[PDB]
Design a binder for these strands. Structure first.
Ligand SMILES: Nc1ncnc2c1ncn2[C@@H]1O[C@H](COP(=O)(O)OP(=O)(O)O)[C@@H](O)[C@H]1O
Ligand SMILES: [Cl-]
Ligand SMILES: [Cl-]
Ligand SMILES: [Cl-]
Ligand SMILES: [Mg+2]
Ligand SMILES: [Mg+2]
Length: 592
DNA sequence: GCTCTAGATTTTCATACGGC
DNA sequence: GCCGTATGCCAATCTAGAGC
């Protein structure tokens, strides 16, 4: 039980308050699917926060990337400073999955490294849902990939209360059983130790805050929070729950039967493959499957154990995997940030995973039961939904098709206007641009350019430097850390222009940008779709002199729709401005 | 209708080796 | 067997075109 406490220095404004009211009505009435159509710069997060606070439900927000995810997490940390705002993503620094490519007859070995901090946050995410109700989890599609059952997860928690009767070494056993390691020398998270009559435990969800449990004989006299760094106390606890240090827990009891069932599966497919004269394939499967089974009878954990998931959980074949979704209560809520991308990405996750595994199975690398170790299908994602709100400036088909209408939110609280749009011929285009950029330089304004290919962006960048202009390029070859710099440098003014391809769109706040130039606008394709064009136009929406130049010789079906949608925004906006008598001011935003 | 291209994101229960 | 350490740049996915 709990209660969201929204904290903000502003009240809802513009299209916000009607949007808030409509979405909340929808939710109370029981509408499953809804769509917030929020123009860029209208403050959708904040709209959404109001909605969360009014309906008071643990909510999951799915983002399509870790940058955005990061930001939402940070934004919502500030809006809900007394509540459990949490983070859930892949915790792998690098990961390469097991795979076989028939076209090259190449097998690739699994390779992976784990980030400790994300692992921690994931444990802080799952535990949080069992302790309290005022929870928001900002997640990637990592939330449709498999976890161990949450009912098993909950039941293995070690409860610890003042007055409890409990033997010390039993507690130690139990901590061990739930994947805590003893460590006296190096007391980091996922560990415990003893110092006399006190047992120190470092929850799997914590970085800088240990639990210090003081014992009498078999009685816990007191329980205290402790700074990992310093060592001082930081609170007196009556009780505290220690959750497992892993989301999967194998238990010896049932591991035995699991092995029989695997060995039985092995025989049957080996036979099946020989019967078909796939003799090398059976040789493979035999060789590895037995090696893995060896390590499950000597040790507990074998390499790629996850392939034997469904067997080790003793569940029937074709079984749906438990995921984070199941860790929420039944009446939870889901927000889907940038739904037009996140949902396709979501749909796609299973397809890649299944394509990959079907091959490994076909060519004798893994058993058919490997395929039951998977993310959710989109169809299963749908059934797990309780209610949901797709947020996006350019909602895709699925959203529109499943939502009553849209809740629209085009009026920005700062009173800013969707930019004006010129269309110009490709003849002499880059000279046109160079001049047009120089004008912007003179008024301390910045310019974004998009092109269709990485090399065109680099060439253009080199020919821009050539003309005296200060510029850098920006595409996927550049590492995420360096990007933040590049952009920081643009805002600062080290650069006056930035040339990109497809990273100059959703999520990008730069109010120093007064101009956005979309080259080859007529070249139809994913870089110049209805939606892509609209999203790139938005980059100029955070400036009073915001302007967009599409360089083309024709006007495609997409440009048609973009010019109209924008035009329409600019009118409704300018109307509301003329009523309230507002003079648009460019977004004052701190750059460091 | 098949096959290829573009830029860009995400996901995946670490493990092979050696020296006790 | 039990440890601590060195180690990776390798897949298939998405949308929406081009070229035969
Ligand atoms: N009701 C409001 N009054 C004043 N400022 C607001 C309000 N709602 C949001 N803002 C501010 O406007 C800024 C821009 O909104 P933003 O979240 O970038 O829009 P979106 O992310 O939906 O495109 C935010 O940093 C936010 O602090
Ligand atoms: Cl399930
Ligand atoms: Cl060019
Ligand atoms: Cl050029
Ligand atoms: Mg409206
Ligand atoms: Mg945003």
């Amino acid at each position: 039980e709990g209660r969201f406490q929204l904290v903000a220095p502003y009240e809802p404004q513009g299209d916000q308050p009607q949007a808030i009211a409509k979405l909340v009505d929808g939710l109370r009435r029981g509408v499953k699917h809804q769509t917030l159509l929020g123009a860029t710069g209208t403050g959708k997060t904040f709209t959404i926060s109001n909605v969360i606070a009014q309906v008071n439900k643990p909510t999951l927000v799915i983002a399509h990337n870790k940058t955005l995810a990061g930001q939402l997490y940070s934004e919502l940390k500030e809006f809900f400073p007394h509540n459990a705002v949490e983070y859930f993503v892949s915790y792998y620094d690098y990961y390469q999955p097991e795979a076989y490519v028939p076209q090259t007859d190449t097998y690739i070995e699994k390779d992976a490294k784990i980030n400790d901090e994300i692992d921690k946050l994931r444990h802080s995410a799952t535990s949080a849902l069992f302790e309290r109700r005022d929870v928001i989890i900002v997640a990637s599609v990592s939330s449709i990939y498999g976890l161990g059952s949450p009912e098993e997860y909950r039941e293995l928690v070690v409860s610890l209360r003042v007055g409890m009767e409990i033997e010390r070494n039993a507690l130690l056993r139990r901590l061990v059983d739930i994947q805590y390691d003893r460590n006296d020398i190096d007391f980091r998270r996922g560990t415990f130790r003893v110092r006399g009559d006190v047992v120190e435990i470092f929850p799997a969800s914590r970085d800088e805050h240990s639990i210090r449990v003081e014992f009498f004989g078999d009685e816990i006299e007191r329980i205290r929070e402790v700074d990992a760094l310093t060592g001082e106390v930081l609170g007196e606890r009556e009780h505290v729950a220690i959750f497992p240090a892993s989301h999967f827990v194998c238990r010896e009891e049932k591991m035995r039967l699991a092995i029989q069932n695997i060995e039985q599966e092995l025989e049957e497919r080996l036979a099946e493959l020989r019967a078909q004269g796939k003799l090398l394939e059976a040789q493979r499967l035999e060789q590895r499957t037995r090696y893995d089974l060896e390590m499950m009878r000597e040790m507990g954990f074998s390499s790629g154990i996850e392939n034997y998931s469904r067997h080790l959980a003793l569940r029937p074949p074709g079984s749906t995997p438990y995921t984070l979704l199941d860790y929420f209560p039944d009446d939870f809520l889901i927000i889907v940030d940038e739904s037009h991308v996140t949902l396709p990405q979501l749909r796609g996750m299973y397809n890649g995973d299944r394509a990959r595994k079907q091959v490994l199975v076909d060519h004798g690398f893994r058993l058919p039961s490997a395929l039951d170790n998977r993310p959710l299908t989109f169809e299963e994602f749908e059934q797990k939904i309780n209610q949901i709100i797709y947020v996006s400036a350019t909602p895709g088909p699925y959203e529109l098709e499943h939502s009553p209408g849209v809740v629209e939110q085009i009026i920005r609280p700062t009173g800013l206007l969707d930019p004006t749009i010129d269309v110009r011929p490709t003849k002499g285009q880059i000279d046109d641009l160079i001049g047009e950029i120089r004008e912007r330089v003179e008024r301390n304004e910045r310019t974004l350019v998009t092109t269709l290919t990485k090399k065109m962006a680099e060439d253009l960048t080199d020919y821009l430097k050539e003309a005296g202009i200060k510029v850098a390029y920006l595409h996927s070859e550049i590492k995420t850390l360096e990007r933040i710099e590049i952009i920081r440098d643009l805002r600062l003014g080290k650069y006056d222009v930035l040339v990109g391809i497809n990273l100059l769109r959703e999520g990008l706040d730069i109010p120093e940008v007064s101009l956005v130039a979309i080259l080859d606008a007529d070249k139809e394709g994913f870089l110049r779709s209805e939606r892509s064009l609209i999203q790139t136009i938005g980059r100029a929406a955070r400036n009073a002199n915001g302007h967009v130049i599409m360089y083309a010789d024709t006007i495609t079906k997409s440009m048609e729709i973009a010019i109209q949608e924008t035009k329409r925004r600019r009118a409704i906006q300018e109307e509301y401005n003329r009523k309230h008598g507002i003079v648009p001011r460019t977004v004052k935003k701190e750059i460091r």
